[PDB]
RNA sequence: GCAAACCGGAUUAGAUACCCGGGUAGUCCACGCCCUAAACGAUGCGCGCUAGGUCUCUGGGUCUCCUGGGGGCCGAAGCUAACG
RNA sequence: AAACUCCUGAACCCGGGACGAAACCCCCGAGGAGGGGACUGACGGUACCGGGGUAAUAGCGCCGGCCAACUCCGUGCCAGCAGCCGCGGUAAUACGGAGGGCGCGAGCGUUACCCGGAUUCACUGGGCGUAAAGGGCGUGUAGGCGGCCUGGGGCGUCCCAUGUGAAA
């Protein structure tokens, strides 16, 4: 780099590739869906996890899962692509609202209702 | 807001008792003496060790506790104190007590924090002539925290008065039980009107 | 070739002050006269001269050796903590007013080259003048 | 205040017009070291009373031709062609690198 | 009578046709709260052994510093290996601010306010050693004079 | 002389390989194209300063030595995360 | 903590109620100064002053490591957790729930996006003997850096004086 080699060039900034090729800032994008599959986190697991094929309101399939056990959809749902890789499904990424036009957490959870649906369990009686 | 409820149940939370709920929190129990240690089933096991960041944090939270406030306004005015070109932390301490709720508390007219705030809110207090409601009110050297004319004609206020006559003011805020009033002066500090804490610890965890 | 002979000089400061040698042998120039002038003046170096070796005008600088320290090995504490070549044949750095460095935020010491010859940090500070930055020491 | 600059006259190859090549100074914002670059201002010589090598002073004016701004004041010196030499040498070396 | 204070420990291990025998270590610093500080690298089979013994090796590898105005003099930087620590004095209204271990030893030193950053390799040990020698290189105007006045 | 590729042979569960009998490309000469390479110091060119104890190619000075550049052993200070 | 007690008066109604509005114009001196008569309020009987005044919404996230908070059945590489290492291959503080607990509070979380960190495009602030990385070596072109003194120009430079650097 020695003063001169420095003066001539100017060391390329950074340029990021981002972890969400959902494009046009889509941490909420359409999700139309189909298929189901299963796979496994690397080696020691086994489960299910859907595959929401989306098409966004722009394009393309991806693998969209949800929170957890207990689905609700049949098709459509407008599942809003979210965005987070976990220890498998080479990509994982872009989970689902759970609420919108389908899903809504499940029916039995006492915590993450802030996205696992269920307004207020409210003992009521 | 201001927690409210099982208040000095949280006095054993610190592990330390405080002039918080006033009466039932000084004399023979802050809910203490009966039992002093962090509440819940887990209180007297055989504790471990809080990391530096954690204990310093603890100290900060204790500060927001004795003053009884959301760390909102608190933290904001802290960096506001960093703006003032003097030694940030200490200057901050003076300008920290300066809030009229617990100011009027240690000035006398209040037994507990909850009290002081409740009262000032209801327009029960008038500094330098103007009757207001704002308890989050800092005061300049030379004011006059007078009390309302019907608030002098109230009772538990007199109780607070006479249950005090024999206490040296924080060497600046004179108590006028002649017609219920308080004369405001100067700026003390952690050496003048101190309290059992270390300030620059809080300061050191504060901004990382 | 040494288009930067000053660099060679302070280089031999590192060398000779490390190897601890009574005084080092080097060439001469008016600049370096002014240099060791201030260098010795601000109580840093011990000496300099205008002698000759092999019939050529050579400069030789003494060094300042403080109290003989001990520990697991003598190593007398050297006044030359460290020097540094600033206006490198490339960075013709220029400076005047609050453009003055600090070096050790208070103490330290530096040297500069203005139309008023070779000055120092606190000196040119009082002066209210400036020029070009050349070297530093502590 | 009409700004002027000391420039080196080149290209007599034109009628009543010469093109001055100049080189200006500046350090570097955030690196340091001074710099000296190409900028060729347009030298307005009414009867080609100036030519190659002869360095002169150049003067900013009003648009006189297609892009031709600037003009010419006092001459500086002759016996030149050395700077010019370096210049066109660089030119040929421009036209010495290819993608064919 | 000082202030016996720790830093961290180490779980050293290796295997053989007799098992996979470990070995343990303790990182301790003896500090009189404010003044003379001392680092202690204790290496031993059992844990509390290494604890107290690294405490006493701290009681052996001593130093102090010009505790100048609840802070330090000049402003400096020190590298050991490929790890380096950064230093500049700060008046009150700044406090002791650095990484875990740095602030730790600085409390074993009695510091009140000091700018200190860390750069390069980020390994506890080398950092601590760098600390110790950097401590040994803190001067005053006095120490300035012995050198800058002549002999 | 030689040897890919190639053939059988031998060996092996298998032998598109070692061990075998052959045998060409080619190895070589001409000019020309390759324009490659662990083109190896895994270490750009130039000047300097900081211990020498010891063999050695050459150059000189009438010479146990001094000395001007190289081929190595060692290791002072210093550098490397460590080897170095 | 509650319950129980003594307590003030949110919200709620009653009496009043703004500022923001003195111009312009008219009369006067001249239609110039000054003074004097005066339309002029949507906002909205609202900020607020007085009275009577009643105890009256609390919710979110974490509880393996980075992090401060762990006790209990269930779950058995199955159902799930998932920022990074990983947790269940039936004694799971990491998955469900329960309790207590920790952060916060009209706020609490989750995701998208720039940066400090990150000295990880290294100017303060980098590396290329084995960790990314020295050209196949020669070679010289533009380019950059220029051994010792005397003076000359004083473009770059330095300080000093001034214009600007608007407001926010």
UniProtKB/Swiss-Prot annotation, chain A:
Annotated region (Disordered) at 105-125
Give a yes or no for keyword Ribosomal protein in this entry.
yes
Location of 3-methylthioaspartic acid modifications: 88
Where is there biased composition of kind Basic residues? 108-119
Q: Output the GO biological process annotations, alphabetical, semicolon-separated.
A: translation
Its Gene Ontology molecular function terms? rRNA binding; structural constituent of ribosome; tRNA binding
What the entry lists under Pfam families is as follows: Ribosom_S12_S23 (PF00164)
Q: Where does it sit, as one GO cellular component term?
A: small ribosomal subunit
Q: Would the keyword Cell membrane turn up in this protein's UniProt record?
A: no
Keywords per UniProt: Methylation, Ribonucleoprotein, Ribosomal protein, RNA-binding, rRNA-binding, tRNA-binding
- Can you tell me which family this protein belongs to? Belongs to the universal ribosomal protein uS12 family.
Q: How does it assemble?
A: Part of the 30S ribosomal subunit. Contacts proteins S8 and S17. May interact with IF1 in the 30S initiation complex.
Report the function annotation for this chain: With S4 and S5 plays an important role in translational accuracy. Interacts with and stabilizes bases of the 16S rRNA that are involved in tRNA selection in the A site and with the mRNA backbone. Located at the interface of the 30S and 50S subunits, it traverses the body of the 30S subunit contacting proteins on the other side and probably holding the rRNA structure together. The combined cluster of proteins S8, S12 and S17 appears to hold together the shoulder and platform of the 30S subunit.
Protein name (record): Small ribosomal subunit protein uS12
Swiss-Prot record, chain C:
Organism from which the protein derives? Thermus thermophilus (strain ATCC BAA-163 / DSM 7039 / HB27)
Homology family: Belongs to the universal ribosomal protein uS8 family.
Can you name this protein? Small ribosomal subunit protein uS8
Q: Name one GO biological process term.
A: translation
Quick one: a GO cellular component term? ribosome
Domain of life, per the record? Bacteria
Q: Keyword set for this entry?
A: Ribonucleoprotein, Ribosomal protein, RNA-binding, rRNA-binding
Assembly and interaction partners? Part of the 30S ribosomal subunit. Contacts proteins S5 and S12.
What does it do? One of the primary rRNA binding proteins, it binds directly to 16S rRNA central domain where it helps coordinate assembly of the platform of the 30S subunit.
Record InterPro entries: Ribosomal_uS8, Ribosomal_uS8_CS, Ribosomal_uS8_sf
Any single GO molecular-function term of the entry would be: structural constituent of ribosome
From Swiss-Prot, chain D:
Its domain of life?
A: Bacteria
How is loss of this gene reflected in the phenotype of the organism?
Answer: Increased generation time and a temperature-sensitive phenotype.
Q: Name one GO cellular component term.
A: cytosolic small ribosomal subunit
Reply yes or no: does the keyword ATP-binding apply.
no
Any keyword Transcription? no
Name the Gene Ontology biological process terms.
Answer: translation
Keywords on this record? Ribonucleoprotein, Ribosomal protein, RNA-binding, rRNA-binding
Q: SUPFAM superfamilies given for it? A: Nucleic acid-binding proteins
Q: Which InterPro entries match?
A: NA-bd_OB-fold (IPR012340), Ribosomal_uS17 (IPR000266), Ribosomal_uS17_bact/chlr (IPR019984), Ribosomal_uS17_CS (IPR019979)
Give the GO molecular function terms: rRNA binding; structural constituent of ribosome
Record text on subunit structure and interactions = Part of the 30S ribosomal subunit. Contacts protein S12.
Similarity comment text for this entry? Belongs to the universal ribosomal protein uS17 family.
| Cited function | One of the primary rRNA binding proteins, it binds directly to 16S rRNA where it helps nucleate assembly of the platform and body of the 30S subunit by bringing together and stabilizing interactions between several different RNA helices. The combined cluster of proteins S8, S12 and S17 appears to hold together the shoulder and platform of the 30S subunit.
PANTHER family hit by this protein: 40S RIBOSOMAL PROTEIN S11 FAMILY MEMBER, SMALL RIBOSOMAL SUBUNIT PROTEIN US17M
Q: Which NCBIfam families match?
A: PRK05610.1 (NF004123), uS17_bact (TIGR03635)
How is this protein named in the record? Small ribosomal subunit protein uS17
Species per Swiss-Prot/TrEMBL record:
Thermus thermophilus (strain ATCC 27634 / DSM 579 / HB8)
Query: What does the record give as the organism's lineage?
Result: Bacteria, Thermotogati, Deinococcota, Deinococci, Thermales
| Chain's gene name | rpsQ
From Swiss-Prot, chain E:
Pfam families on file = Ribosomal_S5, Ribosomal_S5_C
Give me any GO biological process, just one.
translation
Q: Name one GO cellular component term.
A: small ribosomal subunit
Q: Keywords for this entry?
A: Ribonucleoprotein, Ribosomal protein, RNA-binding, rRNA-binding
Query: What GO MF terms are annotated?
Result: rRNA binding; structural constituent of ribosome
Q: Which residues form the S5 DRBM domain?
A: 3-66
PROSITE patterns per UniProt: RIBOSOMAL_S5, S5_DSRBD
Under the subunit heading, UniProt states:
Part of the 30S ribosomal subunit. Contacts proteins S4 and S8.
Briefly, what is this protein's role? With S4 and S12 plays an important role in translational accuracy. Located at the back of the 30S subunit body where it stabilizes the conformation of the head with respect to the body.
Against PANTHER family, the record matches this protein to: MITOCHONDRIAL RIBOSOMAL PROTEIN S5
**Which comment does the entry carry about domains?**
The N-terminal domain interacts with the head of the 30S subunit; the C-terminal domain interacts with the body and contacts protein S4. The interaction surface between S4 and S5 is involved in control of translational fidelity.
Q: Which family does it belong to?
A: Belongs to the universal ribosomal protein uS5 family.
- Annotated protein name in UniProt: Small ribosomal subunit protein uS5
**Organism (species):** Thermus thermophilus (strain ATCC BAA-163 / DSM 7039 / HB27)
């Amino acid at each position: 780099p020695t003063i001169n080699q420095l003066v001539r060039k100017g060391r390329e900034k950074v340029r990021k590739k981002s972890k969400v090729p959902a494009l046009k800032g889509a941490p909420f994008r359409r999700g139309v869906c189909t298929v189901v599959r299963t796979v496994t986190p690397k080696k020691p697991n086994s489960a299910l996890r859907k595959v929401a094929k989306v098409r966004l309101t722009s394009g393309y399939e991806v693998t969209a899962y949800i929170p957890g056990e207990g689905h609700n959809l049949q098709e459509h749902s407008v599942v809003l692509i979210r965005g987070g890789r976990v220890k498998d499904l080479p990509g994982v990424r872009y989970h689902i609202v759970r609420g919108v036009y389908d899903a809504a957490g499940v029916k039995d959870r006492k915590k993450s209702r802030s996205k696992y649906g269920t307004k207020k369990p409210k003992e009521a009686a | 807001g201001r927690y409210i409820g099982p208040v000095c149940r949280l006095c054993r939370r610190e592990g330390v008792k405080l002039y918080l709920k006033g009466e039932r929190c000084y004399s023979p129990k802050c809910a203490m003496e009966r039992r002093p240690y962090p509440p819940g089933q887990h209180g007297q096991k055989r504790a471990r060790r809080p990391s530096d960041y954690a204990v310093r944090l603890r100290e900060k939270q204790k500060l927001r506790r004795i003053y009884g406030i959301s760390e909102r306004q608190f933290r904001n005015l802290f960096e506001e104190a960093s703006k003032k070109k003097g030694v940030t932390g200490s200057v901050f301490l003076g300008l920290l007590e300066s809030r009229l709720d617990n100011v009027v508390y240690r000035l006398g007219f209040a037994v507990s924090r909850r009290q002081a705030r409740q009262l000032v809110r209801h327009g029960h207090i008038t500094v330098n002539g103007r009757r207001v409601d704002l308890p989050s009110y800092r005061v300049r050297p030379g004011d006059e925290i007078a009390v309302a004319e019907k608030s002098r004609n109230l009772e538990l206020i007199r109780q607070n008065l006479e249950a005090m006559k024999g206490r040296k003011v924080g060497p600046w805020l004179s108590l006028d039980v002649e017609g219920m009033k308080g004369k405001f002066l100067r700026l003390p500090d952690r050496e003048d009107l101190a309290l059992p804490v270390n300030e620059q610890l809080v300061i050191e965890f504060y901004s990382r | 070739m040494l288009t930067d002979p000053i660099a060679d000089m302070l280089t031999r400061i590192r060398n000779a002050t490390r190897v601890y040698k009574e005084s080092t042998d080097v060439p001469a120039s008016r600049f370096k006269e002014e240099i060791l002038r201030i260098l010795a003046r601000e109580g840093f170096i011990k000496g300099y001269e205008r002698v000759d070796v092999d019939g050529k005008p050579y400069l030789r600088v003494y060094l300042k050796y403080g109290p003989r320290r001990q520990g697991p090995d003598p190593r007398p504490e050297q006044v030359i903590h460290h020097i540094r070549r600033i206006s490198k044949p490339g960075r013709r750095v220029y400076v005047g007013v609050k453009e003055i460095p600090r070096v050790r935020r208070g103490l330290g010491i530096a040297i500069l080259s203005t139309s008023k010859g070779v000055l120092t940090d606190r000196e040119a500070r009082k002066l209210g003048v400036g020029g070009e930055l050349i070297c530093e020491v502590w | 205040p009409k700004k002027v600059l000391t420039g080196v006259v080149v290209s007599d190859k034109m009628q009543k017009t010469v093109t001055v090549l100049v080189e200006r100074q500046f350090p570097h914002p955030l690196y340091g070291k001074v710099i000296k670059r190409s900028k060729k201002y347009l030298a307005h010589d009414p009867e080609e009373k100036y030519k190659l090598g002869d360095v002169v002073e150049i003067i900013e004016s009003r648009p006189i031709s297609k892009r031709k701004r600037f003009r010419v004041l006092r001459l500086v010196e002759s016996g030149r062609m050395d700077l010019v030499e370096k210049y066109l040498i660089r030119r040929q070396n421009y036209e010495s690198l290819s993608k064919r | 009578d000082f202030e016996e204070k720790m830093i961290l420990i180490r779980r050293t291990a290796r295997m053989q046709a007799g098992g996979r025998r470990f070995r343990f270590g303790a990182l301790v610093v003896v500090g009189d709260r404010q003044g003379r500080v001392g680092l202690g690298f204790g290496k031993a089979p059992e844990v509390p052994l290494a604890v107290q013994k690294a405490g006493y090796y701290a009681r052996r590898n001593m130093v102090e510093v010009p505790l100048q105005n609840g802070t330090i003099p000049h402003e400096i930087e020190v590298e050991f290996g490929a790890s380096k620590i950064v230093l500049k004095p700060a008046a009150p209204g700044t406090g002791v601010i650095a990484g875990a271990v740095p602030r730790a030893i600085l409390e074993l030193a009695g510091v009140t306010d000091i700018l200190t950053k860390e750069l390069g390799s980020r390994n506890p040990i080398n950092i601590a050693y760098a600390t110790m020698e950097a401590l040994r290189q803190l001067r005053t105007k006095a120490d300035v004079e012995r050198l800058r006045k002549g002999e």
